[PDB]
RNA sequence: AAAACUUUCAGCAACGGAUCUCUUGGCUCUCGCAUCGAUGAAGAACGCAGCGAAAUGCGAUACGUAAUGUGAAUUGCAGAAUUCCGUGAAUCAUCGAAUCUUUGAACGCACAUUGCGCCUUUGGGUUCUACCAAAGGCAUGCCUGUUUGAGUGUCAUU
RNA sequence: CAGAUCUUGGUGGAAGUAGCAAAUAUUCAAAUGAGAACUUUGAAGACUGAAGUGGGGAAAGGUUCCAUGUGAACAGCAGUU
RNA sequence: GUAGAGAUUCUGACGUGCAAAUCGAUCUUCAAAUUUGGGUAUAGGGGCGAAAGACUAAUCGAACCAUCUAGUAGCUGGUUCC
RNA sequence: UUUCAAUGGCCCGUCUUGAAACACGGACCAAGGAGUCUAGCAUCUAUGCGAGUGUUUGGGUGAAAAACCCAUCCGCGAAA
RNA sequence: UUGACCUCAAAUCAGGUAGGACUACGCGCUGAACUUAAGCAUAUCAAUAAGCGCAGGAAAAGAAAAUAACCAUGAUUCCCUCAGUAACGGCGAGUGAAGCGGGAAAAGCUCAAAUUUGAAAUCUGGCAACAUUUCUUUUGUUGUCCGAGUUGUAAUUUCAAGAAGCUGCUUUGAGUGUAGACGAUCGGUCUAAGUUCCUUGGAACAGGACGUCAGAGAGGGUGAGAACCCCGUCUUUGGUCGAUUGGAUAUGCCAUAUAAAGCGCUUUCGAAGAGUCGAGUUGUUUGGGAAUGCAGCUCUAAAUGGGUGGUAAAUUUCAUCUAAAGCUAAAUAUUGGCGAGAGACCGAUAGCGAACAAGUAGAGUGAUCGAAAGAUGAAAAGAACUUUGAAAAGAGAGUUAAAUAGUACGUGAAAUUGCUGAAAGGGAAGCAUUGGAAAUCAGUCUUA
C-alpha cells in the first residue's frame, strides 16, 4: 500500500529491475544460450509473495 | 548400479478410486507440470525401474586352481599346433617353425625398429600387418565409454628375463608381451578360442 | 596508468592528495557518462577506478606495515596482525608444550633410547 | 599407451579440458608448425601462433593463401588472416577463421621473450 | 509355502540388512595399501628387522597344545636368565610380556635359547659413532636388513 | 444412374516429434587427502561492468586491488594499445598482502520500526554553551589474575 | 507389449457444434488509418441519481501512474485503443 | 420498516454455471445475547463449540506437511517373440 | 496390388460351469512398461581333482582392481 | 579502633574461552509403529526410523578386578573361523554370541595412596631484556616484582613392582651453529617422426602410391576413420633451476655429571582408588538361561581382602585377575566435503529432481512441493537486390555440398489432416477361400 516499509521498498525496487527484457547485444555473443528472459513477471499473473 | 534413491526422492500417494484415474501414486500440490503425475513405478516416467541394479551382484566367479592350470596347459598345447593357429587367425603360412623359439639376444633388444626387423626376418610381420589393417572404430555405445577402437590380436612374445624386450615390442600393434612364469589364459586363448601364435625366447622355452 | 611501485616510493600525504585528485577525476568522468560521453571517456572510467584501488591498497600496506613494526617484539599484537590459519590450529597445543615431558620420561629416554641395530644373516 | 596415473584417457574429460581451457591454455593449444626454412634454422618443430606472424595456409578451401595474422581469436580457436575474407550478401567482407594446425609459420614476430622461448625449447636463434 | 524337498529355511533376513551390506571391491586396493605401508615402514626403520622377534609358546587347549606358535613377548624371567636387562630389551627390539610366566623349565629353556641366538646374531650400532660401549658392535659396515623368520623360525 | 460426401490405397504437402547418431551430463567402483566458526562461519539481503535481466565472480579498493608466473590480448560492438631495443595485454593462470556493504551463532536495546540509546577521542563550519560528522567501543556464561568492596563468618590488637 | 480406469507426450470424431442472452441504449457527421459497430472530437439520446457507476482513504497489490511508440501475443468479436 | 445482518419458500434461474454455492423474487431480523475492522490468546486425540460431531484456510466421526514406506494384500487388474 | 461376385466369418483381452453379451477394461498413435537380484536349500546336468577337497581371510609377485605363485589354519568329507 | 583470614560479590577490570554450521563414518541419550507371527496381547520389526546432545580425521576401545582347566595363553581393534553354533524363544514365528585357531597391525605406560623437612626444590601473570619464525603474523629463554601454593606444587614410587638399605661394575645433553653429501617433497621448465604425390569431396583426417618415427600405434583437437598438422603420450620414480623438509655425517661451540640411571643379592618392610563392590528389589536390556549389562530406590562390607571360573544356596579347597583414577599410534569405518583415476553402467520419457539460466520457473499462509526444456552449418556465408502487399510475408534472386539445413532450423516415424490420381459405396465396415477384371512385376528362355 501507500504505507510501506523500507525493506519492502528495497524488495520491490530489485524485483522491478529484474523484470526487464534482455539487452540485444547479449544475444550476439558467441555461445550464447540466452534468447529471452526466463524470469519475466506481470503484476496480475504471478505475485511476488513478499 | 543405479542410485539407491532414484525414483523415490519425490513425495507421492495414491489418490484412491473415484477420480477416473489409475490408483498409482501421484505427485501432490500444484502450479507445475509435475503436479498430478504418477510416480513410484517401473511403468512411470521419472519413476524407479523394476529391480534396481545393486553393487552386491556377483561380478567375480571363483575357479578351481587345478582347472585353471588345466586350461593353461591346454592353451599352451594348442599354441604348439600349427593348424589351430591358422584357424585362430594368425598369418603363419610362412613361419619357419611352430613352436617358434628365438635366441636369447632378443631379450636385450632396445629399439622397436630392431623388434620389427626381427619379426620380418622370422616372417611373423604378416600378423602385425593384419592387426594394423584391421584397426577400426567400435560399433555402438562402446566408443562413448573409452572403448574407441578395435583390432585383431598379433603374436604373443614370451620372455624369461626383461632386459628391454618389453619396451622394444610393446608399441607394435597387436603384439602382447608376457613373462613365462605368469602365463595368462586371457592372452593364451583370447576370446575363448585356442591356438594363439606364440614366439618363445630360448630361456623361456627351457623354463617351460 | 599509475604503477604500484612508483606509488610505493611516495609519502602518505602525497598518496592522500593523489587519491583526492583521482576521486575528482572519477566524479567528472561519471558526470560525462550521465550527460552522454564518448567511448574514450567511458574506458577511462575503469582505469581511474583501478588507480584509486591501487592508491588505497598502497596506503593500507604502509599503514599495516607501520603497525607491524610498532607491535613487533610485543607479547600482544592486534588480532588482524596475528595469524589466521584456522580456528582449530590457533587453539591447538604448540610444539613446545606438546614436546614437554616429565623428569621421569626424560631420564628414561636419556638412558634407554631406541637403539639402532641389525641382524646377521 | 599411457602409463601415468595422473593423465586422463577419458574421452569425456579430455573434451571438457579442451573446451573449458582458459585463455592461457588456449595459447598453447593453438600451435602451428614451422616451415622448412625456419625449422632448419631455429631447430624448433612448432611454436604457438601470435599476432602479426607471417604464415601460409596449408589446408582447406584457402589452400596456398598468404597473409599475416591479424588476430588470434582464441575463444573460438580460429586465426584471422589478412586478405582472407569472404563476401557477404550485402557486399561486406567477413574474415574467415582458420585453425592453427592448418597453417604454417613462414616468418615469426621476433621479440626478446620469443627469442628466450626459442632458446629454451632446445632451439637456436 | 513350505512344500519342497530340502531343509527348512533359516534366512536371518528380517531386519533392514541392505543398508549394512559390506562389499569387498577394495580388496586389492586394501592389499596394495598395506604393502606400500609395509615397504614404507621397512625403509623407515632399516637396518633393524621389520618384525620383532617373538617367543615360541604352546596354545592353551587340548586341541592345540601339541603345536608350537609365536607368543607376544619374552617373560621377565626368560630375559633375566638370558642376561638381558628389562629396560635394554625394549630398546634393541626384544618384546617383553610381563603377564606371561614360565611354569616349566622346558618353555624357559626354549625361549632362553631363542634370545641367546638373537643376541649372538645381533649387531648393535653405537650410540655415538666410533665408541663402542659394553654391548656394542665394533664393525657395523656389514649390517643389512634381514628377516627374523630367516634367522630363527618357530620349530 | 454423374458429382459431392464416406471409406481404402499411392504420391506430395502438413501436423507431430518418434527413430537413428552424438554427449563439457549423470550413476557406480577404486585411490589419495583432513581443511569451518566470535581473527565473525554456513546461509541470507542488497549492490558492483561503457553498453546486463539471469548464471559466474566480486564487495563502495565491488565481473575486482597487491604479488608471482606466462607473454600480446579482449571481442557482440565500442574502445584503447604494448611499440615490436617490455616491468607488460589478458573475462589468463596462480595466489603467501589487503579489501570484504547490510546481515546471520550475531554481540548496546530492538526490528512487518535504515527504529532507540550510551561511552571515549577527533574534526567541520559565514553559524561555535548550539548543531553536525568521523573514528574506536558497550552481549551472556565461564576460567586465571587485578582492583574495589560486603558480612551480628573466624580472631588478634586494646 | 494391444490391453493394466497403465505412464508421459501428441492427436482425433463429436464440431465450425454447445456457446459468446444479467447490469434499459444507442445514433449521426468528421478526423485518424491500408483497414472503424468498438479509437478521438462534436451533436443527439439515455443511465448511475449524493446508502452513486461521484470524490477519498485503510488492508492487499507493486509501477498497474505519466508521456511517447507499437509487427505480432493478450483484451473468449474487433481494434488505429 | 431502509442501510446493515441473515437465508424461509419458489424445491424458480443456473446446474461441463457469473459462481467448486451464485442470481432473481418472496421472506426473517434491524438499537442489541446487535453488526464489524485491526491487535491479541487458545493447535491435532488438541483447540473451540447458545451443541450441529459443528468449526479448526474449498481438508474434520480426528486438519495439513514430510518421513518410517516400495507399510501390508487368502482380494482386483495387467504380465511383452515363434 | 486393388475391386467385384459366390461362400463362410459376432469384439477383442478378462474372471467364469458358461461372454457376441444388456459382465469388466479398451477413442486413437508413438516411446516407456511387469518373475529381477542376493543369502541359502533340493533334485538334475557339466567340469576339475578324488579319501580327500577348497588359491583369492591374508602373503608373495605382477607397472597393476587382472594374471601368476605360496605358508599355516579352517570349512565340508573320511563314524556312528 | 586498626588489621589478618574465610566466604561472597562488582568492573566496557588484564588476558582468554564457549556457542553456530557440516554430520557419510564416530560416541551417547531418547525411542516408535507399519510389518512377521497367515488372527493377536509376549515376541518380531528393533536395542531400528524420527527427536536430542558431543567429537575427529578417524572416532571408539586399549595395557586385564581377561581367558581358560592346557605342555596353559596374554592390552585394544579389524578380518577369516568358531557358527546359524551354545543359548534364547505363545521353545511358536523367529532370534543368537564367546574362548581357542589363522591373519592384518603391534607400543607401551601415567597418577592417588610416602617426611624435600638440612631448607616449595614447583607454577601463573605483570614489567624489562634478549631470541626464534610456514610467520614483522610463530614459539620461547633469562632476569625481576606481584601472586598461586603447606587444606600440598616438584623430585621419588605404580604392583610388571618398588622403597629403604647394603658393594660394584656398566651406562649419560630435552643441547645450538656450520659445511657438504645422501633422501623425500609439492612446481616452473625441456621432448621422435609426411602434412610428399594421384583419385574422390564443399573440406582429405578417406582410398591408392612413396616414406618416417616408435621407451611415443593412450586419449583429445583440427571442415569425414590423423602414430607422423596440433596438444599430448613414452622416456619420467628424470634432466634442469629454484624450493621446502628428513635421518645420518663431517665439524665448531655451550655443555659444573660432586651428579643421574640400569643391574646384584636383602631373614626386611611394602602405603594400592567407598554410598564404591556387593545384596535385595523394580524397570530396561542380552544368546546369557533361580539376571548379561545398565539405571532408579532400600541396605551397605572388607583386608590375603575383593572380583570372575556362564544352575540357585551353605561350607571347604583350587586356579585366575587386582575394580571403584588416567593417557596411548598402527591395523578399522567413511551415501559428507576436497582432489584424482577408471568402468562389459545410462545415452535426453534413460542417467541425479536438474546434460540447458535446476532446487530454477511455478504452487501453497506455512511446513513444504517442484517441473518442462539438448542438436542449422565446416564457417552466419542468418538470404544484398528487384517486384506484389498497409504489414506479416510471397514470388524472383542470392548464400551453401545441401535451404529436401532458413533460427517454427540434423534425421523428421505413427496418430491426425489438406490436395491430387485410382476405385468402391441401396441401413456399418474390416476378414478368410476361389477365380474374373484392371494395374503392376519377375523368373524363365534367348543358348550350350
Swiss-Prot record, chain A:
It is found in: Cytoplasm. Its main location: cytoplasm. Pfam families: Ribosomal_L39 (PF00832). This is Large ribosomal subunit protein eL39. The gene is rpl39. HAMAP family: Ribosomal_eL39. One of its GO terms (biological process) is cytoplasmic translation. Keywords: Cytoplasm, Ribonucleoprotein, Ribosomal protein. It comes from Schizosaccharomyces pombe (strain 972 / ATCC 24843). Component of the large ribosomal subunit (LSU). Mature yeast ribosomes consist of a small (40S) and a large (60S) subunit. The 40S small subunit contains 1 molecule of ribosomal RNA (18S rRNA) and at least 33 different proteins. The large 60S subunit contains 3 rRNA molecules (25S, 5.8S and 5S rRNA) and at least 46 different proteins. eL39 interacts with yih1. PANTHER family: LARGE RIBOSOMAL SUBUNIT PROTEIN EL39 (PTHR19970:SF0), RIBOSOMAL PROTEIN L39E (PTHR19970). Disulfide bonds: none annotated.
Curated annotation (Swiss-Prot), chain B:
It is found in: Cytoplasm. Belongs to the universal ribosomal protein uL4 family. This is Large ribosomal subunit protein uL4B. Coiled coil: none annotated. The chain holds residues 53 to 260 of 363 of the full protein. It comes from the Eukaryota. The keyword Transcription does not apply. There are 2 genes for uL4 in S.pombe. Keywords: Cytoplasm, Ribonucleoprotein, Ribosomal protein. GO terms for molecular function: RNA binding; structural constituent of ribosome. The keyword Nucleotide-binding does not apply. One of its GO terms (biological process) is cytoplasmic translation. Component of the ribosome, a large ribonucleoprotein complex responsible for the synthesis of proteins in the cell. The small ribosomal subunit (SSU) binds messenger RNAs (mRNAs) and translates the encoded message by selecting cognate aminoacyl-transfer RNA (tRNA) molecules. The large subunit (LSU) contains the ribosomal catalytic site termed the peptidyl transferase center (PTC), which catalyzes the formation of peptide bonds, thereby polymerizing the amino acids delivered by tRNAs into a polypeptide chain. It comes from Schizosaccharomyces pombe (strain 972 / ATCC 24843) (Fission yeast). GO terms for cellular component: cytosol; cytosolic large ribosomal subunit; preribosome. The eukaryote-specific C-terminal extension harbors a nuclear import signal and delivers the ACL4-uL4/RPL4 complex to the pre-ribosome, triggering uL4 release from ACL4 and incorporation into the 60S ribosomal subunit.
Curated annotation (Swiss-Prot), chain D:
GO terms for biological process: cytoplasmic translation; ribosomal large subunit biogenesis. InterPro entries: KOW, Rib_uL2_dom2, Ribosomal_uL24_CS, Ribosomal_uL24_euk/arc, Ribosomal_uL24_KOW, Translation_prot_SH3-like_sf. The keyword Ribosomal protein applies. Gene3D superfamilies: 2.30.30.30. Residues 1-23 are annotated as: Disordered. It holds the Pfam family KOW. It comes from the Eukaryota. The keyword Ribonucleoprotein applies. Keywords: Cytoplasm, Nucleus, Ribonucleoprotein, Ribosomal protein. GO terms for molecular function: RNA binding; structural constituent of ribosome. Its main location: cytoplasm. It is found in: Cytoplasm; Nucleus; Nucleus, Nucleolus. Disulfide bonds: none annotated. One of its GO terms (cellular component) is nucleus. Component of the ribosome, a large ribonucleoprotein complex responsible for the synthesis of proteins in the cell. The small ribosomal subunit (SSU) binds messenger RNAs (mRNAs) and translates the encoded message by selecting cognate aminoacyl-transfer RNA (tRNA) molecules. The large subunit (LSU) contains the ribosomal catalytic site termed the peptidyl transferase center (PTC), which catalyzes the formation of peptide bonds, thereby polymerizing the amino acids delivered by tRNAs into a polypeptide chain. HAMAP family: Ribosomal_uL24_A. Component of the large ribosomal subunit (LSU). Mature yeast ribosomes consist of a small (40S) and a large (60S) subunit. The 40S small subunit contains 1 molecule of ribosomal RNA (18S rRNA) and at least 33 different proteins. The large 60S subunit contains 3 rRNA molecules (25S, 5.8S and 5S rRNA) and at least 46 different proteins. The gene is rpl26.
Curated annotation (Swiss-Prot), chain E:
GO terms for biological process: cytoplasmic translation. GO terms for molecular function: RNA binding; structural constituent of ribosome. One of its GO terms (cellular component) is cytosol. Keywords: Cytoplasm, Phosphoprotein, Ribonucleoprotein, Ribosomal protein. It comes from the Eukaryota. It is found in: Cytoplasm. Its main location: cytoplasm. Belongs to the eukaryotic ribosomal protein eL13 family. Component of the large ribosomal subunit (LSU). Mature yeast ribosomes consist of a small (40S) and a large (60S) subunit. The 40S small subunit contains 1 molecule of ribosomal RNA (18S rRNA) and at least 33 different proteins. The large 60S subunit contains 3 rRNA molecules (25S, 5.8S and 5S rRNA) and at least 46 different proteins. Component of the ribosome, a large ribonucleoprotein complex responsible for the synthesis of proteins in the cell. The small ribosomal subunit (SSU) binds messenger RNAs (mRNAs) and translates the encoded message by selecting cognate aminoacyl-transfer RNA (tRNA) molecules. The large subunit (LSU) contains the ribosomal catalytic site termed the peptidyl transferase center (PTC), which catalyzes the formation of peptide bonds, thereby polymerizing the amino acids delivered by tRNAs into a polypeptide chain. This is Large ribosomal subunit protein eL13. It comes from Schizosaccharomyces pombe (strain 972 / ATCC 24843). The gene is rpl13. The chain holds residues 2 to 156 of 208 of the full protein.
